[PDB]
RNA sequence: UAA
């Protein structure tokens, strides 16, 4: 009843003056 | 704040397939050019006619066949943008394609990949029907089919495949395999020309099969090696499998390995070739220097056909072919697993037809016949004409026979306003139909077929015959027996008809008993040409062919509408009541009345006609039959409701239901009984130039013009294409664009034989014609540029047409070059002739002043290598075949004659990579600017030499033409010549001073009265200029991998004001300005197929006072841009003091697009009803158009409340209901129904400014 | 007088005509006449990054008082190359014919690193007494900057947007800095031991450091909070450097003699880990083609990688670039050559193969034959190709 | 007007005071040079202001002799250079 | 061990009364127009 | 009038 298509809805990132604000606890090596 | 639309449509074919997708009937031919999917009937004669065409939001990357069960029809597997794969079917009810499901695999190739994605994903089918594969590089996706339709997908490097799989190069599905086997070809250390002396046979093959194991949540594969061959030679590139194993292309070898995985053999195919480095197997040296230097070679394999008790014939045949479009038989011989007599043979073209086509993308076997002796081959071109050949005796007598063609554009490498028309004010006595007006002429081609396509912005008549004062009002012409006699005139306002007797330079006839002192409303021949009927505003007359009258019947109230059929007249008159009257067959001067239905009378009817059609025969007694159409009296009804009935009809009234609201399906049914009429004219009857398709095309009060289409099959239904944008917006419904009715009148008028097309003309101030190809749809053209009052068929196969100003002419349909499809004629000039021909054309400008073309040639010569003296440089080989370089020179085209007039050639390794129409000042003190042509030469030579190049400052003067033929009036003269340091990229003109690009420099010189040109400016640029424009003294230079800057030029103290830079980095292709109001922004169009839109914002906070461009917008192109340009925009209501201006591109694959600016209610408008039209409405492929846009490298840095608008998308608005267009507007805006119409006619009407000039 | 040139016009060029014509990039042959097609490095992906390679030493460079070179950097457009030396002077070469001569004597102490703004706007140079130079490309001195760090300044990186820039120093300190004022943000606390090497995410907002306490760590630059580190580098970590395209990738070099390639996007993951029997030295990506890098030895030895080809050994190795241990490598940013300098006081630039070449892979950077000056005809040749000779040798 | 060469150069910009201000810009190139300006006396000679619409010329280009560095993209000295900043050969030092 | 002035233009050196370039002593000084430039030009408008 |  929506019709098929392709989702787009990407999300905007912050991106400051410092770069763009990421989460940070994704680089523990684990 | 900006709006993209396609002035052209593709026109380069890069797939094709033959199957049954929408009927199976017969097998159809698809075609996709980039993004539309147009599929043909191929005839018995190798005609092309389209049955259905479809337009899709994205670049159609690949096509793929897939059968399902329990319908003979096979699903369309679609591969558009990065890594998307869309499964279509066929709706034969809905007579449309419905997406089956959509598989997205760019997020999983982006996390299975260590670098950035390849940008084209390539599609490979099992032929088993079993599983399809999409490989980016090293990544394949799985797409396994069920014999619910589609298991889930799995996607995996191919390292997890097979273990040494490093660098893949191309991935094949091999045959006669009882499970899905895949063979892949790839180099674990990459070797290239300068790696071959420490690097020996790098590229490996390995075969797997596949056991695909779906699960219902996921789906297993499992692979076994079958074989594997570790030693093969560095450049083979392309895998193209065959019954009993597979052929390698490389560029210098044929490597043939069997299904079990073992080299049989090989053949040398140029002195390049691995001699005597591989020497492991069968060696067959050939000399015929075969190259196949394309990273894909295209080919087509036959399979062998059946004997008549089943054999093999064993004529399975293999055909190459080159970028040149050589075409080349490879024999395999084998009698079982063993192969021999393994040879590759040049097919011999005598009559050289593929002379004028390059790099091939496609070939289809259309008709089979079961022999592979005889081939019918549809083969698409990316520089010529899509060819469809005929191939009769194929052995190692050989011929070869064009069939039919598919226009091809080429590459539109250049784009230029010209006077094509309209270059003598006065035609054949009277002033020029296309008066004033210009067009777009653009280079096409790659090579010799290269040509000039004249992008007509209106259809140019041929004029045979001009008449003055003809005419007041109307005009009718009779044909006693096909003698064009008796041209009645009728002045409505002061109720005089006259006869003209037309056998005798329109002499008047003077006699017969003709109304003279009545406004005649029609009149034609009647009775089978043996009676001539008037019907005056209050009277009807029945005359014979001398004009001595039989019957008169007076009226009431004066008449409005009526309409002739042979033995019937039918008669309208102002209080809305139907008169129907019949002729007497015995012995005439009758006019028997007709009896109506009593449910007519009693509701109003706004126009009628008659018409033959076999739509309602179903709904028929004893007539189930398709031809031997009926005699229907159609009528038109104020609440837009289309009957009919025939003569015996009883007391039942048909509908087409569903027109009333214009829905996208209209089908037939009984009539059972709010005044808001908008239907003015319908008519139904057969277009196209050979294969005459029933059309229903309905005129609106507002002059918009819609079409139905009559399937073939279940007449009694008519569709339209709501997903193709290829008819024309001429009105809006709610009085909307009012000017283009309020003057003229606006009447359809059918012609059966124009020039061999069925065409319909329409009258007002703005003619249109809808013209129909038999390859393509109907479509609207502007026709000329002059009104038209009346229009009445003259002769066989011509019409007379008679303009505001009382003047009549004769047209013909120009169709000698001409090709009537693709939104806008096209006209193809062709400047190379057998006696002189030149190779690409390229850099096309115009000389407004002297009404002159000048293009610039560029053979490809061979190319040798030279050091800083006169010295070959070392590793030179005279014996082989060498890299082709580049002789460039500058033609003098007279557009009078398209005759090059003057020739200039420049010496070796010299390219004109840019050449510019420039007013330049030659003296600022008296402010004197004189039209100079200046070129941009580059010498294309190696890295390691000096760049070099050189800039040519060209007046045209008027010289004495050479007696024996005129248009030689004018001859090049150069002004000033210099050579300089550093390859000269562009050429651009600012404030009457050139700007000219060295190699890593930008120059700006000025030119005196005395011919003396020195420097003034200078600028330093970080690469490599690849564009330039200026808008005043503003600049702006494009570089090749740093976008493009915006330089400011000032005099007298001369300055180059860096002013700003494009943050984001790109290897930009063309520039331009849009400005967009007292605002600034640049179009900018990159590599990678975006269009950016960035804006020059000095008051914005983290600008830098405007050194750092904001970023506004980026749009994905479906191909990449060779060329822009400015051109002055038009305006339909709003005028304001400002001059407005648009960009107009030109498309690699032969489009052409327009960015518009827009206003910001306009904006706000057109983005909320594109907003509406995507999330409410169904599209085509499932595909998004905002994913097929913006999902791009750019799409964080831009303004996400602010992207370009696709006027594609926006144009759907216009093919919806009346009441669906009412909510969609109503969504925001109170009046934003009007005012959406408004500026949608002033988009689509942007470029009209082409035709009113000087 | 006609010298040696290396110009990407004509490539581009061809190039355009390519790309706006549709015609494909043909497939080189092994002969000279086809050293036309080869395109610009911008131009090559995927397979054809094979191309890319700068095996072919094109010119010796040195100038005229033979100084320790401790750092080396192209301008970011590519038209000159920034040679520091040991008595803090500056020198400028030309990259189309590496020839230039005249100093600037920047600063008063060894310059040890040099860095370009991404914009092309500044530069920014540190030295051996801590100060911290700011430079306009057309290098004017705008910032002083006097106690940036204690001790020396080892690196510096901008931020993706080039509002800040992080420094390091044999101090175990890291400090940000907000580019406007030159003012000094938080400082970046930890890393036991001299911290040797830092880099900035190209698009992310994250610090990665090398220091001699084994360690490389991942820093926070609006908290200056740590918030990862590597425990697997055995001895001090000399470099570390994220892809400068992407930034998907963090490759750092230690002195235990191995060079480690992380994939930041999937937790620290450890994608390549080569050993050699020679200490690296220095490392620098490409800067057009990602997944290939370059390392350099302390015996010379340039070797470069291809994470997409072998994960073990590098795609080409060039025995003898140097005779000494060499002390920086620059890309240019078009990528069509490549300049080493190392402790034997000269500049070597390398440029791309040729089609056909008899002296590929021989040339005395390739085999150890440098007999007196080898590499005289090789700086004075007009043509690239040559003839070929013993060795490639010279007089 | 004319489609072949669009009337491009007197276009209503609303950043020209702003390129009136910095640069001391303006979008006509051969505008007269105002008669109150003095290099030397400085931006406050001119009674208009910096909005002037004619042509104030920096000092930079009242030097006698082109700059060889600026030539070559490396003075250090900008608009307080001694030597002309502009591209005029007949200026040149040999 | 003490350097002498090579690129410096001499206007941004001055008499210390480290670095030298005839027998006297000078010291670099910063360029406070470009920088001072620079930061009007970071403000918004102009 | 220079670095
Ligand atoms: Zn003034
Ligand atoms: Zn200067």
Same mark, same amino acid.
């Given at each position: ?30 | ?309 089943? *054999? #093999?014939? =064993?004529?399975?045949? %293999?055909? +190459?072919?080159? @970028? $040149? &479009? ?55 071109? *990316? #520089?010529? =004409?899509?060819?469809? %050949?005929? +191939?009769?005796? @194929? $052995? &190692? ?67 045979? @015959? ?789 | ?395 | ?94 | ?46």
């Amino acid at each position: 009843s929506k019709h098929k298509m392709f989702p787009f809805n990407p999300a905007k990132i912050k991106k400051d003056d410092y770069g763009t604000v990421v989460d940070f606890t994704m680089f523990l090596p684990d | 704040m900006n709006v993209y639309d396609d002035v052209l449509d593709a026109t380069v074919v890069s797939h094709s397939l033959a199957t049954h997708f929408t009927t199976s009937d017969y097998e159809e031919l698809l075609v996709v050019r980039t993004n539309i999917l147009s599929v043909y009937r191929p005839t018995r004669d190798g005609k092309l006619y389209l049955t259905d065409e479809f337009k899709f939001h994205g670049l159609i990357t690949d096509i793929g066949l897939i059968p399902q069960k329990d319908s003979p029809l096979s699903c369309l597997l679609l591969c558009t943008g990065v890594a998307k794969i869309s499964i279509l079917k066929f709706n034969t009810l809905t007579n449309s394609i419905d997406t089956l499901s959509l598989h997205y695999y760019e997020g999983k190739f982006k996390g299975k990949s260590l670098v950035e994605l390849a940008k084209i994903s390539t599609l490979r089918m099992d032929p088993g029907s079993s599983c399809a594969l999409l490989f980016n590089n090293d990544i394949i996706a799985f797409l396994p089919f069920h014999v619910k339709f589609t298991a889930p997908s799995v996607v995996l490097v191919a390292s997890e495949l097979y273990e040494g799989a490093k660098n893949i190069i191309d991935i094949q599905f091999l045959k006669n395999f009882t499970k899905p086997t895949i063979a892949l070809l790839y180099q674990p250390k990459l070797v290239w020309a300068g790696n071959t002396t420490i690097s020996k046979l790098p590229t490996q093959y390995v075969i797997l099969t596949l056991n695909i194991q779906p699960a219902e949540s996921a789906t297993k594969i499992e692979s076994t090696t079958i074989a594997f061959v570790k030693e093969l030679p560095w450049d083979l590139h392309t895998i193209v499998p065959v019954s009993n194993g597979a052929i390698i292309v490389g560029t210098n070898e044929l490597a043939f390995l069997d299904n079990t995985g073992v080299l049989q053999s090989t053949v040398l195919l140029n002195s390049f070739a691995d001699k005597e480095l591989q020497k492991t197997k069968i060696i067959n040296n050939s000399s015929l220097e075969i190259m196949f230097r394309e990273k894909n070679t295209t080919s087509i394999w036959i399979p062998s056909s059946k004997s008549k008790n089943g *054999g #093999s014939n =064993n004529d399975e045949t %293999l055909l +190459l072919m080159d @970028l $040149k &479009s050589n075409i080349y038989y490879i024999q395999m011989e084998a009698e079982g697993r063993l192969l021999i007599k393994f040879d590759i043979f040049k097919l011999p073209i005598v009559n050289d037809l593929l002379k004028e086509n390059s790099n091939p993308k496609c070939i289809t076997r259309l008709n089979a016949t079961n022999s592979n002796k005889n081939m019918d081959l549809f083969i698409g071109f *990316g #520089s010529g =004409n899509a060819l469809v %050949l005929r +191939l009769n005796n @194929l $052995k &190692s007598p050989f011929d070869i026979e064009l069939l039919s063609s598919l226009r091809n554009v080429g590459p539109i490498t250049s784009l230029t306003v010209g006077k094509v028309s309209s270059i003598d004010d006065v035609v054949k006595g009277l002033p020029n139909p296309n008066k004033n007006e210009y067009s777009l002429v653009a280079t096409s081609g790659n090579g010799s077929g290269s040509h000039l396509t004249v992008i007509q912005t209106s259809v140019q008549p041929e004029i045979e @015959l001009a008449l003055k004062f003809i005419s007041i009002t109307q005009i009718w012409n009779l044909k006693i027996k096909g003698r064009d006699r008796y041209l009645i005139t009728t002045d409505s306002t002061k109720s005089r008809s006259d006869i003209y007797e037309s056998d005798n330079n329109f002499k008047l006839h003077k006699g017969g008993r003709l109304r003279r002192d009545a406004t005649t409303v029609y009149i034609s021949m009647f009775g089978e040409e043996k009676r001539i009927i008037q019907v005056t505003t209050n009277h009807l007359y029945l005359y014979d062919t001398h004009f001595r009258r039989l019957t008169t019947i007076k009226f009431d109230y004066e008449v409005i509408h009526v309409s002739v059929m042979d033995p019937y007249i039918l008669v309208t008159v102002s209080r809305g009541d139907i008169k129907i009257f019949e002729l007497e067959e015995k012995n005439k001067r009758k006019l028997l009345k007709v009896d109506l239905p009593e449910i007519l009378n009693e509701m109003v009817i706004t126009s009628g006609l008659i018409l033959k059609s076999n739509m309602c025969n179903e709904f028929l007694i004893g007539l189930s039959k398709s031809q031997e159409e009926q005699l229907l009296f159609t009528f038109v009804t104020a609440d837009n409701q289309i009957i009919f009935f025939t003569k015996d009809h009883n007391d039942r009234i048909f509908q087409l239901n569903g027109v009333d609201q214009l829905n996208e399906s209209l089908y037939i049914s009984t009539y059972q009984l709010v005044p808001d009429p908008s239907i003015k004219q319908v008519m139904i009857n057969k277009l196209g130039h050979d294969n005459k398709e029933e059309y229903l095309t309905i005129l609106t009060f507002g002059g918009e013009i819609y079409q139905y289409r009559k399937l073939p099959q279940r007449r009694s239904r008519f569709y339209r294409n709501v997903t193709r944008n290829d008819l024309a917006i001429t009105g809006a419904p709610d009085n909307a664009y009012a000017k283009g009715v309020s003057s003229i009148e606006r009447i359809m008028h059918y012609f059966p034989d124009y020039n061999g097309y069925s065409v319909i003309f329409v009258t007002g101030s703005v003619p249109y014609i809808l013209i129909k190809e038999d390859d393509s749809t109907p479509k609207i053209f502007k026709f000329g540029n002059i009104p038209l009052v009346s229009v009445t068929p003259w002769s066989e196969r011509s019409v007379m047409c008679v303009d505001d100003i009382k003047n009549a002419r004769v047209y013909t349909l120009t169709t000698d070059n001409m090709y009537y499809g693709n939104k806008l004629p096209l006209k193809q000039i062709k400047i190379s002739n057998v006696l002189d021909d030149y190779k690409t054309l390229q850099k096309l400008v115009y000389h407004e002043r002297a009404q002159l073309f000048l293009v610039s040639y560029c053979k490809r010569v061979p190319y040798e290598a030279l050091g800083e003296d006169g010295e070959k440089v070392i590793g030179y080989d005279e014996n082989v075949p060498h890299a082709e370089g580049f002789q460039s020179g500058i033609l003098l085209i007279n557009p009078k004659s398209w005759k090059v007039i003057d020739k200039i050639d420049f010496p070796k390794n010299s390219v004109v990579n840019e050449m510019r129409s420039s007013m330049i000042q030659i003296n600022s003190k008296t402010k004197r600017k004189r039209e100079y042509i200046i070129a941009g030469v580059a010498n294309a030579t190696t890295e390691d030499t000096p760049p070099t190049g050189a800039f040519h400052i060209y007046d045209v003067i008027e010289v004495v033409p050479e007696p024996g033929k005129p248009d030689t009036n004018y001859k090049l003269k150069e002004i000033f010549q210099e050579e300089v340091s550093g390859t000269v990229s562009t050429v651009c003109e600012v404030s009457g001073r050139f700007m000219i690009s060295q190699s890593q420099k930008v120059l700006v010189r000025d030119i005196q009265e005395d011919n003396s040109v020195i420097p003034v400016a200078f600028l330093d640029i970080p690469v490599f200029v690849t564009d330039s424009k200026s808008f005043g003294n503003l600049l702006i230079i494009g570089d090749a991998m740093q976008g493009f800057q915006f330089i400011g030029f000032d005099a007298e103290p001369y300055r180059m004001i860096s002013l700003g830079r494009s943050m984001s980095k790109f290897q930009t292709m063309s520039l331009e300005f849009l400005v967009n109001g007292g605002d600034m922004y640049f179009a900018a169009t990159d590599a990678d197929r975006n269009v950016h839109v960035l804006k020059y914002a000095p008051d914005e906070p983290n600008s830098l006072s405007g050194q750092r461009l904001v970023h506004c917008s980026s749009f994905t192109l479906h191909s990449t841009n060779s060329c822009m340009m400015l051109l002055p925009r038009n305006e339909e209501f709003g005028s304001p003091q400002v001059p407005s201006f648009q960009n107009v591109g030109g498309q690699v694959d032969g489009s052409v697009f327009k960015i518009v600016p827009l206003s910001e209610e306009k904006y706000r408008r057109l983005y909320v009803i594109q907003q509406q039209i995507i999330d409410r409405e169904l599209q085509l492929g499932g595909l998004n158009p905002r994913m097929e846009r913006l999902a791009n490298d750019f799409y964080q840095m831009g303004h996400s409340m602010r992207p370009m608008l696709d006027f594609n998308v926006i144009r759907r608005f216009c093919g919806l209901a009346i009441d669906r267009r009412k909510s969609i507007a109503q969504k925001a805006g109170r009046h934003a129904h009007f005012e959406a119409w408004r500026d949608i006619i002033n988009i689509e009407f942007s470029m009209r400014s082409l035709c009113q000039g000087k | 007088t006609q010298r040696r040139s290396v110009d990407v016009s004509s490539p581009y060029i061809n190039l355009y005509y390519n790309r706006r014509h549709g015609l494909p990039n043909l497939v080189v042959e092994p002969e000279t006449s086809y050293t036309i097609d080869i395109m610009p490095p911008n131009a090559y992906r995927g397979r054809d990054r094979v191309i890319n390679l700068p095996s072919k030493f094109t010119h010796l460079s040195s100038n005229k008082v033979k100084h320790v070179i401790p750092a080396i950097q192209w301008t970011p457009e590519g038209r000159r190359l920034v040679v520091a030396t040991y008595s803090g002077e500056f020198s400028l070469w030309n990259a189309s014919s590496f020839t230039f001569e005249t100093l600037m004597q920047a600063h008063d102490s060894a310059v040890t690193t040099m860095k370009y703004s991404h914009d092309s706007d500044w530069m920014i140079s540190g030295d051996a007494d801590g100060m911290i130079k700011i430079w306009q490309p057309n290098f004017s001195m705008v910032k002083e900057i006097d106690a940036a760090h204690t001790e020396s300044i080892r690196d510096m990186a901008f931020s993706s947007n080039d509002s800040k820039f992080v420094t390091c120093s044999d101090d175990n300190i890291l400090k940000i800095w907000n580019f406007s004022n030159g003012k000094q943000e938080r400082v970046l606390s930890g890393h036991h031991w001299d911290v040797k090497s830092c880099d900035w995410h190209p698009e992310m907002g994250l610090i990665a450091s090398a220091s001699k306490d084994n360690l490389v760590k991942l820093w926070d630059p609006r908290s200056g909070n740590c918030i990862s580190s590597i425990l697997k580098f055995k001895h001090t970590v000399l470099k570390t450097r994220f892809q400068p395209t992407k930034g998907n990738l963090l490759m750092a070099i230690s002195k235990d003699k191995s060079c480690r390639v992380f994939d930041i996007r999937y937790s620290m993951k450890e994608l390549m880990c080569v050993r050699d029997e020679t200490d690296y030295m220095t490392l620098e990506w490409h800067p057009i083609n990602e997944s290939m890098f370059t390392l350099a030895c302390y015996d010379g030895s340039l070797k470069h990688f291809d994470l997409l080809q072998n994960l073990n050994e590098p795609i080409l190795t060039i025995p003898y670039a140097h005779d000494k241990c060499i002390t920086s490598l620059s890309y240019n940013p078009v990528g069509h050559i490549f300049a080493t300098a190392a402790k034997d006081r000269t500049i070597r630039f390398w440029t791309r193969a040729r089609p056909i070449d008899p002296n590929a892979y021989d040339d005395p950077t390739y085999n150890n034959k440098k007999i007196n000056g080898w590499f005289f005809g090789i700086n004075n040749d007009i043509n690239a190709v040559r003839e070929k000779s013993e060795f490639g040798a010279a007089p | 007007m004319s489609l072949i060469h669009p009337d491009t150069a007197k276009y209503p910009f609303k950043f020209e005071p702003f390129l009136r201000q910095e640069y001391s810009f303006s979008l006509d190139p051969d505008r007269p040079i105002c008669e109150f300006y003095n290099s030397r006396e400085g931006p406050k000679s001119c009674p208009r202001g910096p909005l002037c619409p004619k042509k104030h010329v920096l000092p930079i280009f009242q030097n006698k002799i082109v700059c060889r560095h600026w030539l070559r993209g490396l003075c250090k000295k900008n608009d307080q250079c001694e030597y002309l900043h502009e591209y005029n050969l007949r200026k040149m030092p040999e | 061990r003490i350097r002498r002035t090579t690129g410096i233009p001499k206007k941004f050196l001055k008499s210390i009364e480290m670095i030298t370039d005839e027998g006297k002593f000078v010291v670099q000084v910063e360029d406070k127009q470009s920088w001072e430039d620079y930061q009007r030009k970071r403000e918004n408008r102009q």
